[PDB]
Amino acid sequence: ANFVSWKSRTKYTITPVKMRKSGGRDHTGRIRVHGIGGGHKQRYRMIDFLRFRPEETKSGPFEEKVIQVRYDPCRSADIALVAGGSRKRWIIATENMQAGDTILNSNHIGRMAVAAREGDAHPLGALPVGTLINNVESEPGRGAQYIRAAGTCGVLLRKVNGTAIIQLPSKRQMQVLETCVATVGRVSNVDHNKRVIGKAGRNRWLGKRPNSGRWHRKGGWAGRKIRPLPPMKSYV
Amino acid sequence: YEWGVRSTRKSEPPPLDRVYEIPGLEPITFAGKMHFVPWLARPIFPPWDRGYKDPRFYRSPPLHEHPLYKDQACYI
Amino acid sequence: ARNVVYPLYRLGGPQLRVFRTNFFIQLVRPGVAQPEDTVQFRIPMEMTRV
Amino acid sequence: ARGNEYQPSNIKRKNKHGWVRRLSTPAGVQVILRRMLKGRKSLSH
Amino acid sequence: ADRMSKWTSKRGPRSFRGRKGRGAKGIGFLTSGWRFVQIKEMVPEFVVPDLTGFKLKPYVSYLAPESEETPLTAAQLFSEAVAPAIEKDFKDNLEKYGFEPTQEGKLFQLYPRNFLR
Amino acid sequence: PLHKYPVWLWKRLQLREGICSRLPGHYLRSLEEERTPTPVHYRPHGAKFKINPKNGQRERVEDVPIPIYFPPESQRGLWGGEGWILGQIYANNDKLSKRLKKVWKPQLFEREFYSEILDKKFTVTVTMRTLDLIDEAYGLDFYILKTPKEDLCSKFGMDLKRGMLLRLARQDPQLHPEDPERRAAIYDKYKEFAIPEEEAEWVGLTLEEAIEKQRLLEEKDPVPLFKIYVAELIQQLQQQALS
Amino acid sequence: TVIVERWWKVPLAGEGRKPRLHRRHRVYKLVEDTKHRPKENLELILTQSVENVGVRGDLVSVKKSLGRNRLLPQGLAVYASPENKKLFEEEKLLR
RNA sequence: GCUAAACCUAGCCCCAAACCCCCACCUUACUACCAAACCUUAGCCAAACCAUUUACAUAAAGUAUAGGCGAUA
RNA sequence: GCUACCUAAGAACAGCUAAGAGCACACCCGUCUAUGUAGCAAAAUAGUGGGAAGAUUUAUAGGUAGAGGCGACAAACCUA
RNA sequence: CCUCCGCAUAAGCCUGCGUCAGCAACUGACAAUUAACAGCCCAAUAUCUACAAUCAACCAACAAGUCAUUA
RNA sequence: GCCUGUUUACCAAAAACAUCACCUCUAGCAUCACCAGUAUUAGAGGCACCGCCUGCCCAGUGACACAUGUUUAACGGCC
RNA sequence: UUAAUUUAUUAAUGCAAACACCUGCAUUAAAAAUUUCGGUUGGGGCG
Ligand SMILES: [Mg+2]
Ligand SMILES: [Mg+2]
Ligand SMILES: [Mg+2]
Ligand SMILES: [Mg+2]
Ligand SMILES: [Mg+2]
Ligand SMILES: [Mg+2]
Ligand SMILES: [Mg+2]
Ligand SMILES: [Mg+2]
Ligand SMILES: [Mg+2]
Ligand SMILES: [Mg+2]
Ligand SMILES: [Mg+2]
Ligand SMILES: [Mg+2]
Ligand SMILES: [Mg+2]
Ligand SMILES: [Mg+2]
Ligand SMILES: [Mg+2]
Ligand SMILES: [Mg+2]
Ligand SMILES: [Mg+2]
Secondary structure (H helix, E strand, O other): OOOOOOOOOOOOOOOOEEOOOOOOEOOOOOEOOOOEOOOOOOEEOOEOOOOOOOOOOOOOOEEEEEEEEEOOOOOOOOEEEEEEOOEEEEEEOEOOOOOOOEEEEOOOOOOOOOOOOOOOEEEHHHOOOOOEEEOEEOOOOOOEEEOOOOOOOEEEEEEEOOEEEEEOOOOOEEEEEOOOEEEEOOEOOOOOOOOOOOOHHHHHOOOEOOOOOOOOOOOHHHOOOOOOOOOOEEOO | OOOOOHHHOOOOOOOOOHHHHOOOOOOOEOOOOOOOOOOOEOOOOOOOOOOOOOHHHOOOOOOOOOOOOOOOOOOO | OOOOOOOOOOOOOOOOEEOOOOOOOOEEOOOOOOOOOOOEEOOOOOOOOO | OOOOOOOOOHHHHHHHHOHHHHOOOHHHHHHHHHHHHHOOOOOOO | OOOOOOOOOOOOOHHHHHHOOOOOOOOEEEEOOOEEEEOOOOOOEEOOOOOOOOOOOOOOOOOOOOOOOOOOOHHHHHHHHHHHHHHHOOOOOHHHHOOOOOOOOOOOOOOOOOOOO | OOOOOOHHHHHHHHOOOOOOOOOOHHHHHHHHOOOOOOOOOOOOOOOOEEEOOOOOOEEEOOOOOOOEEOOHHHHHOEOOOOOEEEEEEEOOOOOOOOEEEEEEOOOEEEEEEEEOOOOEEEEEEEEHHHHHHHHHHOOHHHHHHHOOHHHHOOHHHHHHHHHHHHHHHHOOOOOOOOOHHHHHHHHHHOHHHOOOHHHHOOOOOOHHHHHHHHHHHHOOOOOOHHHHHHHHHHHHHHHHHOO | OEEEEEOOOOOOOOOOOOOOOOOOOOEEEEEEEHHHOOOOOEEEEEOOOOOOOOOOOOEEEEOHHHHHHHHOOOOOEEEOOOOHHHHHHHHHOOO
């Protein structure tokens, strides 16, 4: 096959990027994921999930300004164009985030807590324990790889010596280092859950082909599996 | 999170043949031939420069040999 | 000339010159009505307009 | 409607069956060798 | 669907009919706007002598005598071309006699041909 | 019909016709030899004859080798005399069950060595049996200079043999510069493997790489016949001057 | 290493002939895997004031992991060849 | 008496002997010109099924051997 | 190069009433009847029909290959 | 007297009802389609490209979109 | 059978398949699919919009956990 | 498929080997692979 991935832009850019659909196919051209393909055309907004990065020849905590909260076709949560200093970047928006809002992107772990606003980012040692957080890193500098969908939120259950313990929306606990950045509040586009697809065509507009008609018999996997809660996983 | 996947970056050249690690011997490559041969070593070519000047194959100097490069950045 | 490898030209090189012309020419009669100032030839394939 | 099948285009013919594709893989190289050993006039499209 | 016919320029679609041409030669290059630049020096100048007072007609009269074929080997052309110069400069640096070891600075090179025909 | 010569001779005939006929004879001898490696994947028998238990009569035995597959990763490093065994098993070690095929791959270790002759630490993918042979040879330089080309069975190992042999042959003072005594200690230590500089350059080349080397030797920009004919003519007039 | 053995015995070929093999002489039987043998110590000579493995000039028996992995790369020990044991017995006669 | 019939030599086969053979063309082959190769064959079939198995000079000799100790090798 | 699904970048959808809306062309399909059955056709013709701004239809190039692909499962389609 | 066809371009085909000669377009010879349309393009290295389309204005959305530079 | 749609090219267009909706299971994660996504997500299935509802059961199987137990909108059974 | 023989294959462990990966040897599954489906019978199936 001749599959060259579209994910090739090296430099970060504010602009939408023409992206190529996969159809569920591999680089070898065979289907690996069923039920993908044929939706409305989309362009990719590059999101800076590493929420605290400084620009060139600047450092420390820095304020930023929300220019426009914008729909994103590539995910469930809508996004905000956020400009600061000499750079615009797309970040993912929290619940009540308006145009003209101002956000503190911080790095200093205070000796006290930081009674933060709805949409700013802080290291996990700088929060009151029991606040609703989102966009949680796994390592310091890793980037936000957790709790990123629409309306979700995680809660900070307890923080120990060099340690925070997040509760993911799957209600599995996570042990992260104290000095990684998360944002407070819940993610925007709430009531994405209470959304009626209405017809099969609107399900086809999203790039979601219908299921196969092959009648499968349900085996032992298909009960009501009440499991005990999984043990708390650490990244220390 | 670096942008750009591994499969679309510049492909890494294959590792050098273990002939080149030995100091005493001069390697035997397909530079004596003028084409690839898979059962000979791959030679190391000197960095070739076009001697003359050609307009449709001009390659500009990097952004310090340009004779007006101010370190103090202007905003235009 | 035809069936001859032409020497490659780089910028600033000498004029490419043919001394003994390989290809011939023949002027045929026009089978259709044509203007009085027009001569029709049968160029052999490798011979351009210039 | 059946039997129309062959629906011609020269791009799909050269890129499906042409010489450069037959020499792209060693299986097609062996195809060209069977054509020359049989003695055919056209080894490829 | 043909195989036997020669793949000529008259045959493909527009993109195929454009690229392939006849046995002509390139005269210039394409630039933006598809604008063709014709390079003057790539055009062959037909160097044509003056045909005035020239007394060789395209045929030879039948009264000319028959002789033998002696093709010009390298020993003949060395002999009549160089050998009396060697004999006259020997009875009293090989570049003195018309020999050039290298010919990179030469205009009309013998190997490889940079002249035409 | 038939051929004049049989087919398995044809490659040997290729070592007589053209560029291979101008190869030096000590190289072509080193390709014409057919000797067997040391048994690696099978116990060799003791003697040629063997008295079997079923009828008590002595019968001659040989030691048929196991076909060993060498992937090109074995030519990147120094394995032993070993590679993958491509074979078959019976399923429960009785033959009346299913026959089913198995590849026994050797266990690899990316180790590091120091060649005192070539004066360099190499990083070599190696086997445990190779390390045992290095200990049995008392050094990797002795192990590469002692093993025969067939037995050692690596492209890189024959490259190391060619480099060490050229280092010992020329007595190169680039081994340890500004220290000739240490070079004389090394060069006296491996004195036993002294080989002429003609013969050492052809050690461990493949046949095609030796055709390339022989072709690069005897290629010349051809002589213009002006120099030849001037030689003939001044020599001819010196023959005239003696008349 | 892996030492295998043929199930089906090969009919013997002669003095100047190689044994031609059928597809049943490809059926092998694992007689020994050398890695599962009781491993052996190797003899060395330390050349410094090393740990309890030995002192200067002594030939000893070391595990192959410590011997190959630490001593021989770091120049602490030399192999127990017959050639250097002469030099170190002659070192012991200089005492 | 129409259709037709006939024909003899192109060639071929098996041996022996002897070791053979200007220009454009891997891009859409027949186009003047720009930044990487090696990896057990399997199965049909015979065993009246099939499942281990099943062939790929002379003479010793179809001997020693091997083998659902059987087909067979 | 058909067909099943996909990729890229394209295109078409009159008029009338007022949205995977209705009537209705073009276009896509093929319910039912009849003709045809070595036929015009190795599946067509005539009429009737279902849809026709959408999960539409379609041109072009590319991808998936047989121990497989592909499938809104008919165990379909993968050059009659 | 029919026309639901026609004329072009695309794709395909490759001289296949032009002249001369030999149920009631085949052979030989000769001749032609002429670029303005359409193919055949682009000097690097950094740096820019948040605001659909629908007469684009009110509106009204969602499936979130076909179009650009600078040193 | 909710609907529009899909299918056996060339004997079946259907009540079959799909489908909004609902339910069950699996998964705490980056650089070639899923996805440049992160549990309101993704994938594997069942049933078929919405409205009133979905009763009882772990004996057996299979899964889950090895607290001999949990599981039915799992296979299935309900004198 | 709960027919027979397998587990070459993947994925898990376990033990060696080596100081997690790889390799060897066992075990468990999942995916499969090979092969078969006796006879009489007032036709065959049932008995
Ligand atoms: Mg579903
Ligand atoms: Mg279903
Ligand atoms: Mg088509
Ligand atoms: Mg049989
Ligand atoms: Mg049978
Ligand atoms: Mg409608
Ligand atoms: Mg009906
Ligand atoms: Mg309608
Ligand atoms: Mg379909
Ligand atoms: Mg069905
Ligand atoms: Mg059926
Ligand atoms: Mg219905
Ligand atoms: Mg249909
Ligand atoms: Mg049908
Ligand atoms: Mg029907
Ligand atoms: Mg249904
Ligand atoms: Mg009966």
